[PDB]
């Protein structure tokens, strides 16, 4: 009978500790999932991305059946380390419902460090709230 009341009051802090850390990232929109504009965002470091040069792919794909989302913007703010990434701000093509899109860049690191990027996608002009910003953690290159 002591074990039952020990579980609830430890679980009651658990619901609070989760939701206080859930809303800490949902308002910052760190999650790679969305509901209004309905695509997810997966991203990866590719095999050819090794050494001073480094290549970063990015995967967009709509989850509608008939609603092509139209002309969004991808930009990645990042703490300035010694790499360049010469384009840094694309205009994304028209996402058809069903196909996945590879989007590739070229990190050019000069020396050996490691620091995480944050890649955002925005709606066209009005909402700067930045859905689907994915805090990509980088690999330490040489």
């Amino acid at each position: 009978t002591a074990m039952h009341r020990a579980f609830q009051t430890d679980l009651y802090l658990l619901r609070l500790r989760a939701a206080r850390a859930y809303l800490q990232a949902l308002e910052s929109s760190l999650s790679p999932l969305s509901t209004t504009a309905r695509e997810p965002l997966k991203l990866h470091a590719v095999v050819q991305g090794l050494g001073p040069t480094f290549k970063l792919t990015l995967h967009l794909q709509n989850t509608s059946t008939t609603r092509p989302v139209l002309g969004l913007l991808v930009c990645f703010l990042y703490n300035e380390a010694l790499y360049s990434l010469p384009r840094a701000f694309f205009k994304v093509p028209l996402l058809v419902p069903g196909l996945n899109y590879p989007l590739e860049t070229f990190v050019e690191s000069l020396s050996n460090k490691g620091i995480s990027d944050i890649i955002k996608v925005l709606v066209l002009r009005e909402g700067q709230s930045a859905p689907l910003l994915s805090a990509h953690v980088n690999m330490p290159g040489s």
């Binding site: 949902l26 308002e27 910052s28």
Partner: protein
Amino acid sequence: NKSQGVWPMTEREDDLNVSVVVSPNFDSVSQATDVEVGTDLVPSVTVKVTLQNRVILQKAKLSVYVQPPLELTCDQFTFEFMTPDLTRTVSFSVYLKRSYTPSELEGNAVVSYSRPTDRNPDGIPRVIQCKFRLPLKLICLPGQPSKTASHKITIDTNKSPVSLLSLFPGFASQSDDDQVNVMGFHFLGGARITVLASKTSQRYRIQSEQFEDLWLITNELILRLQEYFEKQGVKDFACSFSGSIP
């Protein structure tokens, strides 16, 4: 501890989680960025941006992009500190490399601030985009036009007669032009493109030696039309024909 007061936290935090709670705050104005161009000349055109404020911000950074025939001498900048409602600015100049043709003519500049709302200790990120016009007198050495026959497209207007010499400062034939019906429009690095239909043609067509170069000029001819007519009050927006022959 405080088993009723801590219960007020989870009974309140479950409201925003049940809702969407994405951008619940009024994010109407927290920045303002405007770019203005002076009346300078060939390749190096000086240009000026601005920044406004309403809240103290941090982690701010401003970048600016063009099409790769154009390039910028002074690349992207920083703006370190913010006080409530101050302004700062940075000037720079656009360099021109010896390519042939830029795709579009206007670039855009983008800023990246980070407001620190109390849900996070650091700043949640935001991005504000502005755009800016660019003139065409930096790609400018208008020679004598050549009345020849090549690829053609036809436009027309509502009010037909418009003197081309009045549409801008006189680009071709800085010497004594004895003709108003000159259509001298050599605007690239090593090309030859004229316009047509000064007086006797109500249809306003244009010829081009190569079919690459009409995109930079006809929209410019569309805008310089609309830059003329608001001082007259006609509001004409009509014509084209035969998109199949291109």
